[PDB]
Each structure stands twice: as structure tokens, then as C-alpha cells.
Design a protein around this ligand. Sequence first.
Ligand SMILES: Cc1cc2nc3c(=O)[nH]c(=O)nc-3n(C[C@H](O)[C@H](O)[C@H](O)COP(=O)(O)OP(=O)(O)OC[C@H]3O[C@@H](n4cnc5c(N)ncnc54)[C@H](O)[C@@H]3O)c2cc1C
Ligand SMILES: Cc1cc2nc3c(=O)[nH]c(=O)nc-3n(C[C@H](O)[C@H](O)[C@H](O)COP(=O)(O)OP(=O)(O)OC[C@H]3O[C@@H](n4cnc5c(N)ncnc54)[C@H](O)[C@@H]3O)c2cc1C
Ligand SMILES: Nc1ccnc2ccc(Cl)cc12
Ligand SMILES: Nc1ccnc2ccc(Cl)cc12
Lengths: 432, 431
Amino acid sequence: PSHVPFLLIGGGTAAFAAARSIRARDPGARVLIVSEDPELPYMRPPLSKELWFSDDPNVTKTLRFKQKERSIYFQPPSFYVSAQDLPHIENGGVAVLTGKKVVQLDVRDNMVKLNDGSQITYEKCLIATGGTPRSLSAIDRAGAEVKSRTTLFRKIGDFRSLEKISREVKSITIIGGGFLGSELACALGRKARALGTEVIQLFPEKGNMGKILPEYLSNWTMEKVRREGVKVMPNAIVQSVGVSSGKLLIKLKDGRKVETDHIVAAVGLEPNVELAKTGGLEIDSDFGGFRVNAELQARSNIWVAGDAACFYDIKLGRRRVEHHDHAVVSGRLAGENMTGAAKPYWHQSMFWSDLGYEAIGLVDSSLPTVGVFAKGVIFYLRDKVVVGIVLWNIFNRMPIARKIIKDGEQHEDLNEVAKLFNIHEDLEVLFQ
Amino acid sequence: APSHVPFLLIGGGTAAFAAARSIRARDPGARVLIVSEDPELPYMRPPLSKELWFSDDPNVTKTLRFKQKERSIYFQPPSFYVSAQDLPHIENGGVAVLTGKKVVQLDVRDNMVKLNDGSQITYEKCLIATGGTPRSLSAIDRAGAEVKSRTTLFRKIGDFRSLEKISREVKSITIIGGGFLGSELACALGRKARALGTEVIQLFPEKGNMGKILPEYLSNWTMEKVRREGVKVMPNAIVQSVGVSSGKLLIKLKDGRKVETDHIVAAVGLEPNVELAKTGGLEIDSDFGGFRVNAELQARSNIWVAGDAACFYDIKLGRRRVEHHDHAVVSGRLAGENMTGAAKPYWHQSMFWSDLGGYEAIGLVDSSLPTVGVFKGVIFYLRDKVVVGIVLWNIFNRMPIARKIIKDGEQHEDLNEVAKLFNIHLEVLFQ
Ligand SMILES: Cc1cc2nc3c(=O)[nH]c(=O)nc-3n(C[C@H](O)[C@H](O)[C@H](O)COP(=O)(O)OP(=O)(O)OC[C@H]3O[C@@H](n4cnc5c(N)ncnc54)[C@H](O)[C@@H]3O)c2cc1C
Ligand SMILES: Cc1cc2nc3c(=O)[nH]c(=O)nc-3n(C[C@H](O)[C@H](O)[C@H](O)COP(=O)(O)OP(=O)(O)OC[C@H]3O[C@@H](n4cnc5c(N)ncnc54)[C@H](O)[C@@H]3O)c2cc1C
Ligand SMILES: Nc1ccnc2ccc(Cl)cc12
Ligand SMILES: Nc1ccnc2ccc(Cl)cc12
């Protein structure tokens, strides 16, 4: 189309959530999603979890999993309208222009240019470009043999290619100790403890989830990964990567050497901010991504949501969050504000990890932490105020955590706050 | 004190007035309310350190009129405003000023403010134009009341009247600060002192006046023009302590020197008035200070910020906060248009000038950047080989050319060719 009322750049989780929100408030809305990915909008968490533990031998083809069985696609293709039928169809709809990249953003003229030369004008635009997986400098300096045997896990194709590799090679090494590195380690370890193959995980931190959880909970997570058969090598920094006798040779800075067949690099995300140049949009030098206000707005007719959005939290300060529920929350918020809602980010996004624990706010191990265990609650503190909470094996209490974050009180005794999560007897308080 | 008003402007200074005139130009029936904590109607401040000191009329402290063409410091006569009680009723709307009232609470979700007297006003569109408060020295704050009562923070009409009275009563006045305000008060007090036989001292940490703005060469030239007015300029001076000794103020500098004086004028920078950010949940910029706003001067859906208090995004030059008169006019006007749906980004650069017997300036005029002066002369402020700031030294009617240079963003290969655009055809200086 040459003109569309609502334009969403990027065909991921934030864009879809915004599409459903625009349609929910403007039942006749005409929303066009422009996605460089050839696949329709889909969720990513199953690509490192449920899709690996399915009994169906056609999961790599069906892309279905159990929760209740469902697909990773947000809705079936029949629910979308054609991009050619979007400006004419009665009652509007949602169309997805797959295989097309917005390469230019003209803010003053409310216009975008696609990679094929097409030009589309909009009335209201959302940037939901997500991010690209970061690579290691050591791997970039290496040759094609190393780069071609290194996987950057993000898309459906990465799940299929890596799932295929796990059935062909004897050893796979995961670099990175965050969520993605840990979840792929457990997934490959289970598949490896049956076929007799090897799975290695190495990262610079002292333990898995070191940059998120306190030292004690980080060590416990590392032990749960080791119980799945994974060889976890903490305190590991990569110096070089090369090929030796057809095998990948990773020489660590501390001297150790790891021989493996394939590498999975899960070492963080880089926001996709290419459109900031042509659009004259500000990017945040501290957190990265597009700088937007509390309402996820960049300019009069441009919002930003998802991994790419650096927004202002009225209670916690400027942030950029890179997880699924936040893309849904911020995507929905942008869609409402694109229909005049003028709402600030207020309902905090959360995340969880079945090992299980829930989490909300500024979960950063660099902050002072106070863990209260009986099951436990970990308070992340800044200026004597609770800015982050982790509920360790405590369920149906996230609303309580939302109130604490929202109140912003300087509590005099966090053991009393623990009572709000039913933590009373045999209290073991930990500090870090 | 209306309970509801379409356009609410917080602060009654230069940015607020410019926005009111801009809102009225685009919405001929607009009803604009200015809430000002100062008891005076909107007025311009530059004359308080310049023309009002060099007036032959001995009643300038009462009339507040000066020659440039004679004019008042007030932006318009009081009759052009409408009463706050008649604002929601007057035909074709108008602009009302609620003087003597401070907005002490901002409720963004409810589009409501609370004044210091308990009054509550709801708005449809709001502009924050609170300006800033003069910074003080820690040495003066650590001192006692005897010192604090003999220290002047120059900004408002009352400060001009109070200091003008002091200049006629005391024998020695010390100015702390080498910026515009400190330098202009030095020349103004120096002329008054060369007639009464009094003393004027100016001390600052920089190597010369305007050290943080102009390159070393133009800074030293400015220091010589101030010294020629009778002022004792003491550069490289940092204040360690201030006390009273035999009824006289004793300023001990960190390097050992001691200055005895009767009164102090502290012009050591400005602190943006961002008190309303707490209750309003508004972001402030930790790097530049002030309210953080985007290229359109917008903070939230119905809230803009202009003037000295606004930290905005320049599409060409990056994030900035500018503290001068023309910028309050430019950003105030821009906010007024965007409050009437313009959606325009800051694009037309604000400028400033200084008559030194003069020069014009535009962009990032910061001496910490590399400079290339071509001398009449033009000084280019460079960043990544791109011209981000220009100072036209005794070159007039060429600011449009300077505006285009800033707008182009070229990485010029020879600034001597760009100098020809200002009719400079040769002493090239570097810093
Ligand atoms: C394997 C995996 C597992 C995860 N598991 C979890 C989990 O368990 N829990 C959790 O909370 N989070 C998880 N996450 C994170 C979560 O998936 C992300 O937060 C979420 O996908 C971000 O949504 P998004 O819309 O911001 O971006 P994306 O999903 O990356 O979508 C952006 C889309 O826009 C496209 N695009 C970019 N630039 C352009 C352009 N110029 N023109 C057109 N299209 C463009 C990109 O190609 C991409 O297709 C996981 C992520 C991965 C990769
Ligand atoms: C003595 C002097 C000389 C100057 N000379 C020059 C010059 O020659 N050239 C130049 O370019 N610039 C000059 N400047 C700078 C220029 O005057 C300022 O940049 C300009 O005043 C900024 O306008 P403003 O509206 O942003 O703020 P202000 O003029 O400070 O106006 C803000 C007003 O809002 C009021 N206010 C604050 N908070 C509240 C509240 N909560 N409720 C109600 N009211 C509130 C403040 O009291 C103040 O009255 C000079 C400044 C001074 C002080
Ligand atoms: N379980 C997760 C919670 C929060 N953020 C994540 C980011 C990436 C991956 Cl793979 C998993 C998570
Ligand atoms: N000439 C000036 C230019 C820019 N900013 C100023 C601030 C205060 C004073 Cl007194 C003068 C100026």
C-alpha cells in the first residue's frame, strides 16, 4: 500500500501486541506490519524451551508445543488480511508485509521507504525492530570455518539449524551465562544425556545468571544446569577461536582450552536502531535503543516498544527491557497511545523461569540485595528503596510485589515486608 | 484564579510570554493563563545588566525604561492582558497573568496544578517555563548571615534595584564569576565606579573572561576590555572561604591571595527550577540539568517545556540545554505552535550576541571543543571535523550563512574556503 493509518515496523511480539491493542480500541483500524523476517509474527521463548522437550517428531515442522497444545505463531495466517486488500477491505484489519525491510524513515513527511523502493505514508507509526544478537570479537576475527560453525540463536531457523546440529555433532559449546545460554544448555543437556554427547557452557561470570541473581542463587542455578549433564565453566573469558583437526579450539584467557564441534554464542542483544539515522531520532548512549518518554513516544506520530525501546519509568528511572512480557506490555501500551490513550508505563512487566521464580523491576545483581528465606523473596535496593523483587518459589503474590515497587517506601524492616509474601518462621536473611 | 483554563503556562518570564503570543497567533480565540511567582508582569532581563545601568534618567529604578529608540523592559503594557477573572468570558479570549502565585504541585494524569495558596487549576495543555535560580557558592553558604546578607544573586528586577543602591553606598564591590552576567555587571559597575571613585573587583577560576565560551585569544581580549573600564580582574581565582573582618568582607582565595571588599555579587551560573518534576513524575536530565524533552519540546502528552529549564534534543547538534534570551523566545514560540498541533522540531537555531564597544554566535559555542579562528574574523567550533558552532567577530548581516553551515553538517576540507563565505580573504588560529 502507498498509505496506511497505522504502520508497525518489525513483525515480532511488540508489533503484534500493538496491533491487537489498536484493533481493540479502533474496531475499524487498518494496521500494516512490515517485517524483514519471512515468517509471520511468532513468540520466541518456545525456541529455547518447549520445542526441545516435545515427544512429537515433527516439532521442527509443526512448531507446536504443549503448555494445552498451541503454535508459536500468535494467530493463524487466515486471521490476517492481504496487504493488497488492506486499503479496500471492509472493517479494516491487520496485514503483514513479510520479506520487506524499512530502510528509510522520513519523519517530517510521515513516510518510509522499503528495501525494494516502495514508499508508504502513515498517520501513526510504531518502531518495534527488536535487536540483533551480539557476536564475540574473537569470533569475528576468526575465519569462515569458525563463523559458519557458530550459531546466533534468535529465529525459527536458528532452532531448526541447531536442532539439526545436535543430531550430527558430538560436542556443542554454549558461550554466555544468561537466560538464553542457560536454557539452551539444559535443553541440549537433556537431549545429550540420552545420546551420549557433550554440552559445555562457559561464561565470564562466577555462575549462571550472575548479572541478575545474587551470588548464592546464581550458584544454585549453576548446579541445576550441571545436574542436566552440562559441563559449566564459569570465570571463562574467550581470547581466540580457531580450527584444529576439523574441531573448534577455544583458548580461554585463563589458559584453558576447549575442543568442540559447534558453538552457540548467546552473549546479549544489540538494539536495531538503523532507522534513527534517517529519521533523526535520538538514541540512548547509556542503555541503547530509541529514547522515548514514559508513554513510549519518540515524536508526535512515532512510538517505540519492545527490546528496542529505551523508555522512562516514573518509579524506577530510564530503562531498556529485553524480555517477552515487556514486549507484550509495551506493545499494548503503544497501541493504546496510538489511539489517543496518553498512558504512561505503569503496569510493570515481569518475567519468570521454571527451574521456579518470578521477577519484577530492576533485577540487577550489582545493586544491594536482601534475601529473606523460610521459598523466599529477594529485594533489590537503591537508596533504601525496593526497586526490584524476585519471588523464589512464591506464587500468586506478584500483585503484592507490584504494590511495593509502586509505593516506593523506604521500609525500616524488610523482614516485615517479607510477611506480605507469607514469610514468617525460620527466617534466614542474606545480604550482598 | 480560574478553576479551568485551556492553555496554562507555568512561569511568567520570556519563554512563557513568547509561547502566549505564539498560541494566540495560531488560535485567535485562545485563552492563555500565565501563573508567575514574581509579582511583576513578564519582562526581559538583559537590560538589568546593561542599558538600565547606562541611563541618564535618575528614575530608571522606578520607570524601568531605557534607550537602545526608548522602550520598557516589560514585553507589553499591562492593558494588553485580560483579568484572570475575565479570562474564560472575554470575547476572542486573551492572555491573563496570575502574579504572586507559585505552582507547587503538578498532577499530570489529572491535568491539574495546585498553587501555593491551595488553588487548583485544570488545563488542557500546559507549558513549563520556570527558568532557573542563581547558583550560590559553598563558601558563601558555609559563611554566616553577615556574609549572606552582603551577597547578591543577580537575576530579577529587585536585584537590580538592591545592587544599584549598594553601588551608591559602598566603596568596594566584588563580582565572582567570569561569564556574561559577571562580566557585564563588572563593566556596568565600573562606569558607576569611575564617577563615584569606588572600587570594582572581578575574580573567576578561568584564565580570562568568557573562558568557557570563547577561545583563549578572544577571552583575553574580553578581559582587557573589562580591565579598561576600571575593574580589577583576578583570573585563576578559586574561593576558599568568606568572612567578616572589622565590618569588611574578607575573601580568601585558594591560592593564598586575600581580597577585602564591602559587597559581593555572585554570578556563578544557573540552576534550573525543576521542583515540579517530583510530584509530576517528570524526567530531569542528569547531564545537562532541566526537564528532559524531545525535539518538539514535549515531555508528556499535554506538557511542553521551554526556556532555560528545558533540556531538548537538537536533530542536528544533539541533546542541549540553552540559557539565553533569544532561545527562550525561539523555544517558547515553538512550544506555543506545538501546543496548537504544529508538531514542529527545534530547527531554526537560536542565537546570541554581545556588544563589546560586537559579535554574534550560534550553535555549540563551547571553548572545550576544538576551535579554528580565521581573522574581523569567524571562529569555527568543530566536532568530528563538522562545524557545530560559529562565532562571527565583527561580521554582520551574515548569520543566515552561518545558519546554513550548521544545517549542512559537512565535513569541510578547508575552513579558509568557508571563511570566504563571511568575506574573510589572513590569520588562522587553532585551539
Ligand atoms: C530463543 C529466545 C528465547 C526467549 N525466551 C524468553 C523467555 O523465556 N522469557 C522472556 O521473558 N523473554 C524471552 N525471550 C525474549 C523475548 O523473545 C523478546 O523480549 C521479544 O522477542 C522482543 O520482541 P520485539 O517485538 O521487541 O522484537 P523481535 O521479536 O526481535 O521482533 C522484531 C522484528 O522486527 C524485524 N525488524 C527489525 N528491523 C526491521 C526493519 N527495519 N524493517 C522491518 N523489520 C525489521 C526483526 O527482524 C524482527 O523480525 C527470548 C528470546 C529468544 C530469542
Ligand atoms: C541580568 C540578566 C541579564 C541577561 N542578559 C542576557 C543577554 O544580554 N542576552 C541573552 O541572550 N540572555 C541574557 N540573559 C538570559 C535570559 O534572560 C534568560 O535566558 C531568559 O530570562 C530565560 O527565560 P525563561 O522564560 O526561560 O526564564 P525566566 O526569565 O527565569 O522566567 C521564569 C519565571 O518563572 C518563575 N517561576 C519559576 N518557578 C515557578 C513556579 N513553580 N510557579 C510560578 N512561577 C515560577 C520564575 O520566578 C521566573 O519569574 C540574561 C539573564 C539575566 C538574569
Ligand atoms: N526466562 C527468561 C526470563 C527473562 N528474560 C529472558 C530472556 C531470554 C531468554 Cl532465552 C529467557 C528469558
Ligand atoms: N549576551 C549574553 C548571551 C547569552 N547569554 C547571556 C546570559 C546572561 C547575560 Cl548578562 C548575557 C548573555
